[PDB]
Design a binder for this molecule. Structure first.
Ligand code: CTK
Ligand code: CL
Ligand code: NI
Ligand code: ZN
Length: 330
């Protein structure tokens, strides 16, 4: 068995290996990459996403989200308070202001310690989930706006056409902005490209151990767990690496830098934070191996988790017994 300890693997494809996206995902899995839940891909030196980032300041962040924490330093939830619209140029200036800028630090480990010590005492503002793309249309390799669609994958594997579209999203971050513990909708894959700026640190639980994280979360967030049997799908709960280690939860960590891709695999729980002003682009995708995960994925039906129009058909076709109850939740 490849990668039996479930370590995060790092890949360096050549320019020729970077041509066929599906083929390279399958290659990574043949080496055991999916057992970690997350892999890093460093593009060949000949590749570029676009020519420059000098002309992005007029993009609008229509609803910046202030991430307000409750709890204790290592076990907390966050809620999102909507703020007035601002451009990317205005957001970058805000991220770099004395109130929000990254503190002095010696290395990524020092900054990680500062994050877990001090995150709850501040409320950073995240420009998350903006529909759009920063890839140049002439970039033909690993262009997140030109991947095969999940709807076409389901049709190819199972035989019928479904409605729906999926397109990429942009995330403009600042110091301490946080993504909570979650798997993707319907336990899909995701791919994330860090276009510009300061790093993004990731934590991940191997898919084979995801239930261990779920059990700990129910113990640590007892009211939330009573309200919804899949409450991690609300994307609001944080648990620190120290607390995970105290409870014996298997996990790994890695820092992503500008110019690097991260792929999350089906049922790979992940969480993390931004080091400073940055911009990432992300999209969900599927492969033939995803189908059995989609068939078994848990659902939030309590009302909290977001309406995503494309998920309707995935539940309808893969989980017909659950569809009626799930639909009432939407
Ligand atoms: C911000 S959230 O906690 O309300 N929703 C999190 C949505 N999922 C994500 C977000 C990131 C990211 O921010 O880079 C990376 C991977 N998965
Ligand atoms: Cl700090
Ligand atoms: Ni995610
Ligand atoms: Zn729920």
């Amino acid at each position: 068995a490849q990668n039996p300890n479930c370590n995060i693997m790092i890949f360096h494809p050549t320019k020729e290996e970077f041509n066929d996206f599906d083929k390279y995902i399958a290659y990574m899995e043949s080496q055991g990459a999916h057992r970690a839940g997350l892999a890093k891909i460093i593009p060949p030196k000949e590749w570029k996403a676009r020519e420059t980032y000098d002309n992005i300041s007029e993009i609008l962040i229509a609803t910046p989200l202030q991430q307000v924490a409750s709890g204790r330093a290592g076990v907390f939830t966050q809620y999102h308070k909507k703020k007035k619209a601002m451009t990317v140029g205005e957001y970058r200036h805000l991220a770099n202001s004395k109130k929000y800028q990254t503190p002095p630090h010696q290395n990524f480990e020092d900054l990680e310690r500062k994050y877990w010590k001090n995150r709850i005492y501040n409320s950073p503002i995240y420009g998350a989930d903006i529909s759009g793309s920063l890839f140049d249309e002439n970039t033909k390799q690993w262009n997140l706006g030109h991947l095969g669609t999940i709807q076409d994958l389901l049709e190819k594997e199972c035989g019928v056409v479904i409605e729906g579209v999926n397109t990429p999203y942009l995330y403009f971050g600042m110091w301490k902005t946080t993504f909570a513990w979650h798997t993707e909708d319907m336990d899909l894959y995701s791919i994330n490209y860090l276009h510009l700026g300061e790093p993004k640190t990731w934590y991940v639980v191997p898919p084979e151990h995801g239930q261990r994280l779920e059990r700990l979360a129910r113990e640590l967030f007892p009211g939330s767990s009573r309200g919804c049997g899949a409450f991690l799908r609300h994307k609001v709960a944080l648990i620190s690496p120290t607390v995970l280690k105290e409870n014996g939860i298997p996990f790994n960590r890695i820092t992503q830098e500008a110019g690097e891709f991260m792929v999350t695999f089906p049922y790979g729980y992940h969480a993390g934070f931004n080091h400073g002003f940055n911009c990432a682009e992300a999209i969900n995708f599927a492969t033939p191996r995803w189908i059995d995960y989609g068939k078994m994925a848990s659902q939030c039906s309590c009302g909290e988790a977001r309406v995503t129009f494309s998920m309707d058909a995935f539940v309808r076709i893969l989980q017909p017994e659950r569809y009626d109850l799930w639909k009432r939740g939407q």
